[PDB]
Design a protein around this nucleic acid. Structure first.
Length: 756
DNA sequence: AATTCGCAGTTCGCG
DNA sequence: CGCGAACTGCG
């Protein structure tokens, strides 16, 4: 199993290291034969010996073109000849590429920004995380001494906890009377003991929660103050702290540093991403938070350190359990994309698609288009029309079916062969023409993307077959993760086409996909209404809700099935309309906001305040209770009574403050805000006290009694003191609870004033 | 740093 | 000074 690749330099030459786990044994394979390269398109082929002779400077060393070679490649499906330029060292490419490009005899250069170690995985056809290897995992966490106003890591680390399959332990340098606590005499001894634990356990994976931006940088700065060689890497190196623009990321050579924090933020939608909230959401069990003020207080007084150590132990324990839950899924992502788990677990959609495509392009001798520079990025600013959204027939409906297309956009891409290499390609026998926008797509050969998509969807079906047939629980589950990752990847191609930073950006492809989607859904709506007598209540992009106004539940179901047989005989290629479900009742509030109830009483909500982090729990819970009384009991009277009891509890200050918290993400640097809403106001005051506020921070605040601007009486919920602060009961009535329920209960004649 | 589609709370500036 | 537009966030 390949874990990662990198390179080191030996006598001026790159040596690739392949880090592997084979038969339970860690191995480093060295490859001295791989040459960095990129491609150049020349106006005339005699110009090569001119550019073959260009040189650059790399702090000290002159940089030469090592050697050149003419190759035949495809570019967007058309044959092309280019010069492959080889170099001695990968750092030669950034030093020289701008000067080779600026040459008047060079039309353009290509594949000039591919990191050497990732280039190696692609060109050698190596796929990380393949095979039957069990990885040894170890989670760790730290507790630090924090004082408001101090610089980062001016205080000592107080405890280091770690956990694996054998249990969890805490190292600390004060006496704590617990069996899982190991006491050493100093902070230096604690770090050194932790280093020895990691060396002795020799894990393949180090799991942290936000270790990229807290734990390792804290450890590093203490190790600098204390004179510790923090040799965590299997090659004896220190953790390598890389700038990723906004934040940092930390590598441990020969291991996989698996930071759960970027993984969870991209995998689950939670109102906040504290370790306690993530653990409770994933496993359903509570985890108690101990705050920095309490930790520092316990350390300086020497009292109740057992509580701090138990919290520290539990941090490591739940980090391990979360690592066990999420690492297998990320390993399948790594195998599918063909890049290291470290990389893919820190990457966004656009990057992941692009790395998959670069590997496929290499496999097919397709030269990669370049990323856009500034002038092209501005040229790609234009938007295009998206999915069709019908204004709902608002209100309460009975006996509804939902019909939707199976994977509408992937079906369109495959059926109509939508790809930048087939777009208006001249000379073909056959074309499909996008409605409205008119783009033509050659059908004579499978386009690059449709071909990859079709392979993906076919592989996913084969995995589902192997899953049901396989006789192995571990294999069955890894297959499940793989088919889920394939679905996400296949569903990512449409948006990637419209992504202005994409190498294979194609706005014509993107808007042809949406145009066909609009044509299929609106034509299907027309057929069901005109030929089958349905009333379409609401429709959004790839599906619609419909009923037969005067009909009973069984009539609606059966005629829906008849329509499906009718319409699917008319739909071309991979387009397929499917029966998604029957809902006894549904309430449609606005576009993209509705709730339905199935025959077993399960309520599904979409777009409603109940799902949003920026609405208080008291409002969300009231909306939920109103929707239960309407959809399940058909009892408007009960729903109104519910609202009146909630508004009465608020005005008597009987609601727990925890149900009044509003969670809102900070999305940018605080000085970049043109306007200051309440969460920005809270964040700015926290940053004034020295608190680290970065994009992605979730501000959790409560609105206090007073008047004027909400932001002027908003405070972090952590600071809420029910003895010195009064929450704004009227604010949570008038701005939270009543707005969330009013738009539902208006359909039955009630105004806000009859609910207070 | 996937897309376009959508709703709505807060703040503020304008007649 | 009530109203709407801008800003903002998150489905």
């Amino acid at each position: 199993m390949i874990l990662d690749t990198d390179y080191i330099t030996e006598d001026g030459k790159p040596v690739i290291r392949i880090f592997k786990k084979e038969n339970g044994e860690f191995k480093i394979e060295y490859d001295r034969t791989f040459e960095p390269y990129f491609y150049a398109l020349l106006k005339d082929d005699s110009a090569i010996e001119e550019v073959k002779k260009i040189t650059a400077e790399r702090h000290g060393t002159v940089v030469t073109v090592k050697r050149v070679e003419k190759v035949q490649k495809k570019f967007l499906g058309r044959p092309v000849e280019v010069w492959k330029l080889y170099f001695t060292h990968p750092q030669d490419v950034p030093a020289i590429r701008d000067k080779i490009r600026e040459h008047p005899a060079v039309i353009d250069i290509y594949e000039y920004d591919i990191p050497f170690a990732k280039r190696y995985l692609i060109d050698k056809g190596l796929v990380p995380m393949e095979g039957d290897e069990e990885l040894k995992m170890l989670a760790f966490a730290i507790a630090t001494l924090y004082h408001e106003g101090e610089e980062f890591a001016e205080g000592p680390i107080l405890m280091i906890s770690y956990a694996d399959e054998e249990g969890a332990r805490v190292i600390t340098w004060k006496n704590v009377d617990l069996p899982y606590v190991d006491v050493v005499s100093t902070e230096r001894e604690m770090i050194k003991r932790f280093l020895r634990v990691v060396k002795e356990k020799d894990p393949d994976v180090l799991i942290t929660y936000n270790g990229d931006n807290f734990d390792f940088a804290y450890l590093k700065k203490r190790c600098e103050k204390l004179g510790i060689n923090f040799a965590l890497g299997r090659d004896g190196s220190e953790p390598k702290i890389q700038r990723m623009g906004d934040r940092f990321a930390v590598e441990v050579k020969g291991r996989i540093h698996f930071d759960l924090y970027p993984v969870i933020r991209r995998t689950i939608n939670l109102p906040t991403y504290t370790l306690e909230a993530v653990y409770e959401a994933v496993f359903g069990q509570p985890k108690e938070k101990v705050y920095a003020e309490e930790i520092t207080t316990a350390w300086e007084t020497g009292e109740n350190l057992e509580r701090v150590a138990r919290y520290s132990m539990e941090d490591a324990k739940v980090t391990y359990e979360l690592g066990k839950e999420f690492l297998p899924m990320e390993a399948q992502l790594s195998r599918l994309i063909g890049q290291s788990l470290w990389d893919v677990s820190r990457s966004s959609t656009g990057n992941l698609v692009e790395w998959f495509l670069l590997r496929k392009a290499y496999e097919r001798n397709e030269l990669a288009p370049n990323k856009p520079d500034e002038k092209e990025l501005a040229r790609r600013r234009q938007s295009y029309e998206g999915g069709y959204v019908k204004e709902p027939e608002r209100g309460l409906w009975e006996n509804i079916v939902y019909l939707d297309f199976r994977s509408l956009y992937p079906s369109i891409i495959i059926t109509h062969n939508v790809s930048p290499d087939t777009l208006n390609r001249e000379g073909c026998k056959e074309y499909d023409v996008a409605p409205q926008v008119g783009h033509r797509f050659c059908k004579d050969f499978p386009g690059f993307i449709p071909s990859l998509l079709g392979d993906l969807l076919e592989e996913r079906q084969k995995i589902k077959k192997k899953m049901k047939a396989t006789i192995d629980p571990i294999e069955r589950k890894l297959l499940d993760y793989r088919q889920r990752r394939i679905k996400i990847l296949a569903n990512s191609y449409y948006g990637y086409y419209g992504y202005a930073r994409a190498r294979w950006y194609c706005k014509e492809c993107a808007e042809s996909v949406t145009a066909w989607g609009r044509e299929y859904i609106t034509m299907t709506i027309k057929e069901i209404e005109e030929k089958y007598g349905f009333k379409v209540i609401y429709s959004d992009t790839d599906g619609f809700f419909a009923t037969i106004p005067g009909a009973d539940a069984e009539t609606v179901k059966k005629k829906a099935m008849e329509f499906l047989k009718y319409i699917n005989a008319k739909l071309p290629g991979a387009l397929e309309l499917e029966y998604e479900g029957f809902y006894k009742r549904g309430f449609f509030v606005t576009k993209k906001k509705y709730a339905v109830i199935d025959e077993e009483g399960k309520i599904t909500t979409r777009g409603l305040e109940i799902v949003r982090r920026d609405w208080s729990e008291i409002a969300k819970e009231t909306q939920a209770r109103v929707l239960e009384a309407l959809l399940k009991d058909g009892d408007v009277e009960k729903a109104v009574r519910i609202v009146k009891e909630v508004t009465e509890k608020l005005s008597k200050y009987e609601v727990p403050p925890e149900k009044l918290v509003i969670h809102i993400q900070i999305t940018r640097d605080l000085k970049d805000y043109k306007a200051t809403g309440p969460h920005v106001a809270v964040a700015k005051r926290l940053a004034a006290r020295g608190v680290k506020i970065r994009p992605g921070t979730v501000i959790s605040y409560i609105v206090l009694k007073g008047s004027g601007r909400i932001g002027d009486r908003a405070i972090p919920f952590d600071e809420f003191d029910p003895t010195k602060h009064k929450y704004d009961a009227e604010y949570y009535i008038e701005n939270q609870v009543l707005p969330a329920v009013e738009r539902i209960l208006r359909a039955f004649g009630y105004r806000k004033e009859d609910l207070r």
